[model samples]
Target: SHMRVAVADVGTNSSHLLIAEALPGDAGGFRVIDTLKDRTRLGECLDTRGELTPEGEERLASALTRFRELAASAGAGDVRVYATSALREAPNGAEVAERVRQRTGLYPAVISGVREGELTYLGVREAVELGPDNVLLDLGGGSLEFVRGAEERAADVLSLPLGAIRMTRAFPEGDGKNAGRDVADAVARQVRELLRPHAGRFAARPGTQFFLSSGTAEAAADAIAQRRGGRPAEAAGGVNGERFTLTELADLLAHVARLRPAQRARVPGLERRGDTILAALSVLHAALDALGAREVTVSEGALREGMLIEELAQVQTFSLALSTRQRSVLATAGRFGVNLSHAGQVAELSRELFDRLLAAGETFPPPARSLLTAAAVLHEAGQIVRGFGPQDIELIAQIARYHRKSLPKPSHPDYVALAPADRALVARLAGILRVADGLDRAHTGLARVDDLRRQGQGWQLRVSGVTPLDLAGVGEKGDLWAREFGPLSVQN
Candidate 1:
């Protein structure tokens, strides 16, 4: 599709733009031909009340007007305005966005942290060659987005509200005495709950690579290169030649504390401007330490760059579908060492039933269908730990057990492997899958369900498999399935 689109990112530190066209290929790519950016700290005066001070609003408005001209100059067919951190949190976000739209004809959308993470993942897939073991890190003014998984994109991801500006506010350098560890602990505390579940999953993965986005990360790369007795390197991705460890960073943090900005610039590889670099390194130190990440490669494309890539191509639909279904399922199943054979079987049958019955009536949207599809892939995942035998009742009980009841001990490796949402959803859906699988456990291999869809007030489950089986238990399972859907019945 040869189409042009422009995107504006109103962020806490700067306003940026990208104009591009979708490249024709199987990869679904975009080529950016124009770019613009102006530093405008929109979150300048945001206090604890989540209200933007008057000066903060004025600064943001001026930045948007500047971006408006860039959009027109780029000859964009359509423009998308998106606000992050600042607009999303501020009390007058709607009012501020509306005024901008009225003036520039650019309707801004406030994206949530979850959606922001998805977008960064999309950008990472498009712009960076994320090998099987790569973690995409985006450092913004509002939040930190980590896309940690393999080549196909991170099956697991996270977002933390620990950005450069936010952190700077939290820890004032105050006469260069703020040790880096202090900043690290502060950022770590904010994301501790979110990080606990997936800590060890990506820690030791082979070929691990950290793909970082932010001017500050770039500045870090620039400084690292200079430290190795080299001039400012090219403005792009990947950094090499200099190495720093957690221990080294700790020492350097103390060393930098006593230096002024000029003195910081004089350091072997430190950037001339220490403000952004300091905050960036603080976040860098905290995130890598928490994830046990050792190496990082800087990318020029941050959130604004990510937005441009999404606009140039109609990538959101395909990307989100793959994520909501395949990625979601894999993450859930990985937690339990689920038998792929069983998962494939249940996924196929459940989908067939959903499509024929529920889909026929348009009872669920694609997103919900995708979630249900994930549920099926992990239906018997609980079996990994519970090891239910041939007894149908025991299997049912094992599946229904909740986290507090049957979950692995807190210290169990698997317990730390699953995010909270994954644990809850998989536990529930696996229970339903257990009952469904048991009903057909005979595996007499003759059961065929047709017209097994939602029709009127009941779902018809046609079975051609062996009979004289436990119809009572299957009946109970069917009622539970009906309850999951609504006030309905199961007829065979």
Candidate 2:
């Protein structure tokens, strides 16, 4: 959820909030009803004495507030919170559970490292359709959960205090030989040593499928996605179910390991996560190598999803109802107090216009659907704060810009912030959004794009919901539309 403001910020320990709902019938499936992330560096908030620093407590409270508000709006039935390995490690960790319960009125459980592994196994089983023999690894800030020999329960489950934050602090010292030792090599060596004790029993065999989840895996996968030049991670709807190879992760690790903290922090997808990504990647790389795996499928679901599955099985449930992209958009809009009715109205109209253009012969890329929907829903959010915190904010904000206000200029900072390709995509969608949002100017559901047909080069739209609409001349709103998608004649 790097979108906390593009998601790669230095908060290597972001708290993930997944609002999931159960699906009906025998499938026992669920959809991520909505998902939100706060850059709660709860792991980094610890004092030198392994106790909760005062500031850390504040972040805990603040994150709880964010999670609680969103959970409340989603109509969460049983709100159960678990403090993972990090909370368990802190001497005053029990206070975290107490404080959390007091603030949100939901009892919080302090989950030990091994229990973390077990629950993560349950969660991983639900997220991916895996082969009979599989190994699951979920990396966390304070511990790493590893499960081997898949079943309702694994033959062996273990948790190690080798989480990214811990490893980062222990990285160069991994082998107690940091006397001018190469950063990458030490990381590689230390990871193997740390994992040596359990590798014999927990390591995967030749045919075992490997799957991984955690903040570390996510940040790494997002980097891989960005490197591949796919759909800009967040806008493309996340990296869930995407395949990641060791070669990709290794190359990334090699490049970032030598960089100073400042330069590293700005890495394209790693943003705020730059500091610990090396250790995280090193652990993943070594872990995968030790287990005889070349590649692993990434799952966005982790401890929380696992928690949901374990808690709901007895209760009868499982999912995030909307696509990850849609849920994320709705949650952001709701958080910002955007008028859901108005935003949904704009989104629907935006969808119609985009479709009309595509059917009429525009080359809308496959990912554009997700991007367009995101922009349409978040279009109103731009006017509120200029943008959210994630990587896609500029892309979304720029698209929203031309749709409501004016076309982007070469001189504008927002426009310049985007790549050339991004600018092109933003321009075209902003144009489409402008026309669609303007169609709902009345906000009373007065007008709608009931139908569309082509006369010649351009298409004509039939507006049937309301007649004699005040937007008789759509020149202002449809300026970008006409330029980008040719002419569009409308009728009532």
Candidate 3:
């Protein structure tokens, strides 16, 4: 059974609602069912007096009311709502929360910026496997959160008042009407100053990776994709782990800073974001420069997703134990109606083979282990929608794809879109997955990995639980393995 959960995030710039189904038992995960956002611009109307303008209050209330009703209609039993930045800093933020409770029978919690950073980290860590030296930035409208830590826990978190809306308001002269290289430099300097103290903490750690979340980062990436023209839009079937270099962002910042709001609105991907696009880019570039990070990748998850996952864990023990990547992969598979039994079996066998081979001294990066595991689990996901057709295999292969007559070529859009290193890794992992998948061709859990032995430059895999094994079927999947390991011999 699945539990319906919804989250409403009322931020300074916008209000967002996400509805999802959380599968509780084994293969437990949450699948997003519906998502909604309202550009209420609470921060735009936040007065210096620390009070929400009447218009902002009314708009926020209406958005929340509608979102609550939407959650009810969508069969969401657990609806989580939170307010950040604007409401947290507002003198009457609690009054707004009370008004919301009165209108919708749901109480909204105002979370501190530090908590916001932690939650955002949780969400990103779950989606993107952060390492010990990775830094995450949640560029919200009213506050930009910086979190640095290991994959499992955060070491340091700083919430600064360098959000898109806050920065725009702080230097109104940097707006479209006053756009120029000088204005961009001015805003950049301000962003640098705000990030100075924390900059050394992250930048000094060599090889540290950076990831960005929130609407601002997404918009920036989308705009870059639009400008580049060769890549698909971010939300489309394009690569989820899209990255932008400082050089590319600087070019974008320079171009956008010269355009007025009306003109900026006309730019591709800047449509509804004309008002704060420049400021967002300014903050992004400045942060990157301050941290000495050459590139920053985008994260799909954020505070709202983190909150939802935390809530789900309170009730689902199994979900509480799964690793961030495991949960994300399981959730994606569930959304596509994958064959959980077959997926579990294949993934297990794939890991068994991968580990045995690594123990036998095969050379592949350590991270490749996780990638192979994810690929094995999702290898047949395409079958859910296309029923084992070429298109189906392609979709499955997008995450990790197949063998024999089929091979990964640059002509394939999905394959072409992958980074060179990723392309090679996927091809290798997919090859291994193909052989494992073939071992379970019957999907009856009959074949078992009894043992493995190194055979000179080749390898020998001993299988039990089935006699007169289908070497022909196995051969069909050994194309990639042979390429990597020279030759493979199977004994049953």
Q: What RMSD value applies to candidate 1? A: 19.1
TM-score of 2: 0.58
Write candidate 3's Cα lDDT for 311-360 as tens digits: 56543443344468666776677577564445665676787888888888
lDDT of 2: 0.66
lDDT of 2 by residue, 1-492 (tens): 211100011122766666666565524456677767777777888888788777877777676677767776766533445667666777887665566556755434454566667767777777677677878888877777778765566677877777788877875433333321255566667767778888876676778778888777877888888887765568867777888887898888777766665566787878867767767777788788877788889887676776656544422211133366576677677677554445666777788877876776778666677677777777777444322356466667667655444465657766545667777888888887887777755333334687777667666777754312225435557767777766777775
Q: Where is the poorest 10-residue window by lDDT in model 2? A: 1-10
Q: Who is ahead in lDDT, 1 or 3?
A: 3
| Candidate 3 C-alpha error for residue 144, in Å | 0.5
User: Listing every candidate in turn, what is its Cα RMSD in Å to the true structure after a full C-alpha superposition?
Assistant: 19.1, 22.3, 21.2
- The local distance difference test score of each candidate is 0.58, 0.66, 0.73
Deviation (Å) of 407 in candidate 2? 69
* Candidate 3 accuracy as TM-score: 0.62
